[PDB]
């Protein structure tokens, strides 16, 4: 990780600007729906401009430029922005085909950028680095983080995996690789305390977290990962005549929280946020009551 001096941070601004120009192409017919690069990248430049404003003398810039998280962040942003630029160049006319693999990769990158924005606003609230004070929401998860990493804001994946394995054993590399793609929202091969917080909130309780993660995100056909409210309604339309069809999903706008969509006996699509109980438990309760019967339309619910 190169040092994050103002020259480097500015070089990243120019790259993001290219991505914004490329995404303004009308032939693209880009829909205003989260994650929306034309919101995320400008807001990211703004937050970076804020951070740099605070580190105004030369002993502050030495702090910021040497900040391990910030060094990693700026390097990711530059790599992801170069990737996006490469995507349009190599994708050429295939970028206007709203269903092409080139546009799907652009959507993948827009999620990442969105996750990176939420992270930096969390780690640098109001441009001031607060990474070592970040309060992990689940207490037993926070015990784990402080025990093995203490004050750190960001941790190499390999380090994180070995320490997690001491407490919750991973069965295989394929599992570890699926776990990585789940926890590592920003796809930078690191685990920040923000990503850890999102993960242990989604798949609580900590004491059985890997079982919960497998049950919800690996083996459950009802899991849909990131969808907007409208996208949930759209996907369930084909099942509006099959009450009990349901899916559950995440929101890139409100990380760390689950939502469920399901079809009522009348053929209506309702969506609900399970406040104050783990998702696997809401699904188990929901199944018994007769609401959550056919995950994504299949004919049986996965075995608890
Ligand atoms: C039971 O009533 C609801 C259930 C859901 N619903 O299940 O989607 C959504 C809505 C409500 N909205 C919100 O409440 C937004 O505030 C939150 C707060 C926490 C959230 C946690 C997770 C989550 O999903 C991962 C969402 C929804 C999202 O981010 O998309 C959250 N939204 C937004 C979206 C919206 C858009 C269009 C119609 C609509 O009614 N609403 C209501 C009342
Ligand atoms: Mg990461």
**Spatial separation of the C-alpha atoms in residues 251 and 241, rounded to whole Å:** 26
| Ligand 1 centre distance from Cα of residue 229 (Å) | 7
The answer to whether residue 303 sits within a structural domain is: no
Closest C-alpha among 38, 22, 21, 27 to residue 96: 27
- For residue 300, being part of any structural domain is answered with no
Q: Residues annotated in the binding site, as ranges?
A: 184, 186, 188, 190, 195, 249
Residue 154, domain extent? 133-217
**98, HSE (Cβ side, Cα atoms, 13 Å):** 6
The number of domains in the chain is 3
Q: Residue 235 and residue 246: Cα distance in Å, rounded?
A: 10
CATH of the domain at 212: 1.10.238.10
Q: Which of 235, 271, 283 to mutate to test the pocket of ligand 1 (most atoms within 8 A of CB)?
A: 271
Q: What is the resolution of this structure in A?
A: 2.4
Ligand 1 midpoint to CA 260 (Å) = 10
253 lines ligand 1 (CB under 6 A): yes
Residue 276 CA to ligand 1 centre (angstroms) = 15
Query: Residues 103, 104, 105, 110: is their CA dihedral positive or negative?
Result: positive
DSSP 8-state code for residue 248 = E
Which ligand is nearest the CA of 246, by number?
Answer: 1
Q: Look up the CATH number of the domain holding residue 285.
A: 3.30.505.10
**For ligand 1, atom 4: residue with the closest CA:** 272
Same domain (yes/no): 290, 226: yes
Beta bridge partners of 295: 246
Is it true that the peptide bond before 35 is cis, omega within 30 degrees of 0?
A: yes
- Of 262, 251, 298, 258, residue with least CA distance to 281: 258
């Amino acid at each position: 990780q190169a040092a994050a001096d103002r020259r480097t941070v500015e070089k990243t601004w120019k790259l993001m600007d290219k991505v914004v120009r490329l995404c303004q192409n009308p032939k693209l017919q880009l829909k205003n729906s989260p994650p929306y690069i034309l919101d995320i990248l400008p807001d990211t430049y703004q937050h970076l401009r804020l951070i740099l404003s605070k580190y105004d003398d030369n002993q502050k810039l030495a702090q910021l430029s040497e900040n391990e998280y910030f060094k990693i962040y700026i390097d990711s942003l530059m790599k992801k922005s170069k990737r996006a630029i490469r995507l349009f160049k190599e994708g050429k006319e295939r970028m206007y085909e709203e269903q092409s693999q080139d546009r799907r990769n652009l959507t993948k990158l827009s999620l990442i950028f969105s996750h990176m924005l939420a992270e930096i606003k969390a780690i640098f609230p109001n441009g001031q680095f607060q990474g070592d004070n970040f309060r992990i929401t689940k207490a037993d998860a926070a015990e784990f983080w402080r025990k093995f990493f203490g004050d750190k804001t960001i941790v190499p994946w390999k380090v994180f995996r070995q320490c997690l394995h001491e407490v919750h054993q991973i069965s295989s590399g394929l599992e570890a690789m699926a776990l990585k793609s789940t926890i590592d929202l920003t796809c930078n091969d690191y685990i920040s305390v923000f990503e850890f917080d999102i993960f242990t909130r989604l798949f609580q309780p900590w004491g059985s977290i890997l079982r919960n993660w497998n049950f919800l995100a690996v083996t459950h056909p009802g899991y849909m990962a990131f969808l907007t409210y409208d996208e949930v309604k759209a996907r369930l339309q084909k099942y509006s005549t099959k009450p009990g069809s349901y899916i559950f999903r995440l929101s890139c706008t409100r990380l760390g929280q689950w939502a469920i969509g399901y079809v009522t006996g009348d053929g209506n699509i309702l969506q609900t946020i399970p406040h104050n109980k783990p998702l696997f438990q809401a699904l188990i309760d929901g199944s018994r009551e007769g609401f959550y019967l056919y995950p994504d339309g299949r004919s049986y619910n996965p075995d608890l």
